[PDB]
């Protein structure tokens, strides 16, 4: 009767957590492989999406296996003569593993980073288990992580869900191809603890409960007095 | 509780063992079919990858069935007018079989060399059993092979895993297409004997334990004395 209100169903639906854009071109004389968008890594951050952040932060703890669906679509806004048949490496960097700094790093061929090779226009799909270090993720952390010094009060590495890195395996053509990648995360086997108050005010930081200053009142005023229906 | 530390799981994961690059063009007036990259053969050598070499040489003997996943991706860095639909012959040359010297040899149509015909952009996948001559592969060989003469001390043909040869079945277009092939080996049904010391020093040769001269000390110095924590 109330199967839509389950936290398996309320929190467990595929949202768009990341949209990046990488390019297929040559690295001849290219200094920065991120300003050129030869690759993009993304620290997996479900609180970057404020609609899913506001739903996850209705609970103190949450434990879920992950489920990533990756849609890569190409684009060639220049003279092209053909639409190229491209392959994207979508490499999952686990927590504690090093991220790529170049598109031709050693990290892309590292056997311990699982990577998906799929075509552009097709879609990838894989699942990552609960890769937290606690028995649940911490939506809120009242304290410091690993240290007696200043550790930013709630910024903890217990909530590290990994990282996704994306490049095009193909070499360059004579035209530039722009691949836009949409990562779709679905929390599965969700279980949640200690329900909290819903957040009324907007966000200013990730991992911090800081609300903006001189913001607007969330409790809206009546058009009359307290006796007015 | 410790299923990641099994040698089925520690040694049994798909690493990138070979990245080659072949070209689709005409052999009209082409002398060398390797300098032109009309084909490439590769003696299957898991100790070419020093991350998998350093893991295999944690044991004296290792016996595994093989599992090759081959990803061929095209590239046309010239004027092309279209992306061609190409087919790659990925031919497994078994141990003791002759390798190709030309891309149009008799070896490519030899029935005893198993070959995979797959499209560029797609991926190949096949498995080769334990093709060693001993009951396990020799990560280390203290002695000589088959001869009373000088036989290079550890260079033995017992560890021959075969050879992979790669060409494009298609004939030429009016443009040159560059296919880059990535071979992904996964050791399966792995079993290992006589655990050895981890190698501290880098490599200089394949099949030889020779370390470079005037190298750096692997045991790193303290920032204080022996009493300093």
């Amino acid at each position: 009767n109330g199967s839509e209100t389950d936290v398996e169903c309320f929190l467990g639906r595929a949202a768009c957590v990341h949209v990046t854009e990488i390019q297929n071109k040559d690295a001849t004389g290219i200094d920065n492989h991120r300003e050129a968008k030869l690759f993009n890594d993304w620290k997996i951050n479900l609180s970057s999406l404020v609609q899913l952040r506001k739903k996850l932060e209705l609970f103190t703890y949450v434990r879920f296996d992950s489920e990533y669906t990756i849609l890569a679509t190409a684009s060639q806004p220049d003279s092209a003569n053909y639409s190229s048949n491209l392959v994207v490496q979508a490499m999952y960097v686990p927590p504690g593993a090093p991220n790529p700094k170049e598109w031709d790093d050693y990290t892309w061929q590292s056997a311990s980073n699982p990577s998906v090779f799929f075509k552009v226009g097709d879609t990838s799909r894989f699942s990552v288990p609960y890769v937290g270090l606690a028995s649940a993720y911490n939506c809120f952390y009242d304290g410091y992580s690993h240290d007696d010094a200043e550790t930013q009060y709630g910024i903890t590495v217990l909530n590290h869900m990994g990282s996704m890195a994306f490049r095009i395996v193909n070499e360059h053509d004579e035209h530039k191809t722009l691949v836009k990648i949409r990562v779709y995360h679905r929390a599965k086997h969700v279980e949640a603890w200690i329900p909290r108050a819903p957040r009324a005010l907007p966000y200013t930081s990730i991992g911090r409960t800081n609300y903006p200053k001189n913001t607007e009142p969330v409790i809206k005023k009546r058009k009359g007095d307290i006796k007015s229906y | 509780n410790g299923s990641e530390t099994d040698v089925e799981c520690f040694l049994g994961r798909a690493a990138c063992v070979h990245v080659t690059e072949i070209q689709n063009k005409d052999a009209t007036g082409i002398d060398n079919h390797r300098e032109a990259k009309l084909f490439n053969d590769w003696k299957i050598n898991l100790s070419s990858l020093v991350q998998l070499r350093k893991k295999l040489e944690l044991f004296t003997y290792v016996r595994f069935d093989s599992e090759y996943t081959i990803l061929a991706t095209a590239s046309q860095p010239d004027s092309a007018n279209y992306s061609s639909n190409l087919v790659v012959q990925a031919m497994y040359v078994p141990p003791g079989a002759p390798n190709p010297k030309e891309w149009d040899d008799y070896t490519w149509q030899s029935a005893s060399n198993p070959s995979v015909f797959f499209k560029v952009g797609d991926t190949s996948r096949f498995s080769v059993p334990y093709v060693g001559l001993a009951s396990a592969y020799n990560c280390f060989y203290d002695g000589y092979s088959h001869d009373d003469a000088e036989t290079q001390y550890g260079i033995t043909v017992l560890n021959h895993m075969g050879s992979m040869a790669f060409r494009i079945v298609n004939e030429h277009d009016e443009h040159k297409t560059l296919v880059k092939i990535r071979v992904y080996h996964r050791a399966k049904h792995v079993e290992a004997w006589i655990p050895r010391a981890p190698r501290a020093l880098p490599y200089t040769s394949i099949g030889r334990t020779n370390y470079p001269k005037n190298t750096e000390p692997v045991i790193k110095k303290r920032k204080g004395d022996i009493k300093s924590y």
């Binding site: - | 410790g2 040698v7 497994y92 004997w193």
Partner: protein, 215 residues
């Protein structure tokens, strides 16, 4: 009537699938019994290997495995180390070469010392374990007021000490040794005698989330 799902035609490298054999009907070379079959990497890190605690040299040598002991030194410290087994003295051991293949270890350690000086020499060394979160001792008496063994070198030539279960990945604990008594050498046998320290894992040692060292 079937529908292809998302993630069709992908190659997830970690997804172990069966494959068509490129050599069917090939009968491979039969398995003989080679001794020493290793099923588990948690079998071989339980073998204790020497620790280079004498890192004080700019080159690698056998002297780095030797913990030097000195006569006429009382209440000084013999050695001291933290118990990060991915860095420092443990980074090149068999435990810490296989720990640094993975990300999280979380087990108990087995720490040994071995006195290799003469059979007539005797001393008392006090072997302090400082747990993680605490400060390592800075005199012999703070070491005695904590967790320790007063190890008589004259009687017991090899001591084996089990470091408690940690989940260590300051932190991870400390481990020092102090002179309870001065080193009494046999007559007209003067100089330095040495200790050999060993590390391994207790059989409750786990290891998870395999990663990749580079060079």
């Amino acid at each position: 009537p079937t529908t292809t799902l998302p993630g069709s035609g992908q190659f997830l490298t970690t997804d172990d699938r069966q494959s068509p054999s490129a050599l069917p009907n090939y009968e491979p070379t039969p398995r003989i019994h080679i001794p020493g079959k290793v099923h588990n990497l948690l079998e071989i890190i339980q073998v204790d290997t020497l620790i280079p605690m004498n890192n004080t040299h700019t080159k690698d040598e056998v002297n780095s495995y030797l913990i030097p002991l000195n006569a006429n030194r009382q209440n000084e410290q013999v050695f001291g180390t933290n118990l990060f087994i991915g860095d420092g003295v443990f980074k090149t051991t068999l435990l810490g070469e296989i720990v640094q293949y993975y990300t999280h270890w979380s087990g108990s350690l087995r720490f040994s010392l071995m006195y290799t000086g003469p059979a007539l020499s005797s001393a008392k060394l006090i072997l302090a374990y400082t747990p993680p979160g605490a400060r390592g001792p800075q005199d012999r008496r703070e070491a005695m007021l904590g967790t320790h063994v007063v190890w008589d070198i004259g009687l017991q030539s090899t001591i084996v000490m089990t470091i408690p279960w940690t989940s260590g990945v300051t932190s991870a604990g400390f481990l020092s040794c102090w002179y309870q008594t001065s080193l009494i050498l046999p007559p007209e046998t003067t100089g330095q005698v040495y200790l050999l320290s060993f590390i391994s894992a207790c059989p409750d040692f786990k290891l998870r989330l395999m990663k990749d060292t580079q060079t």
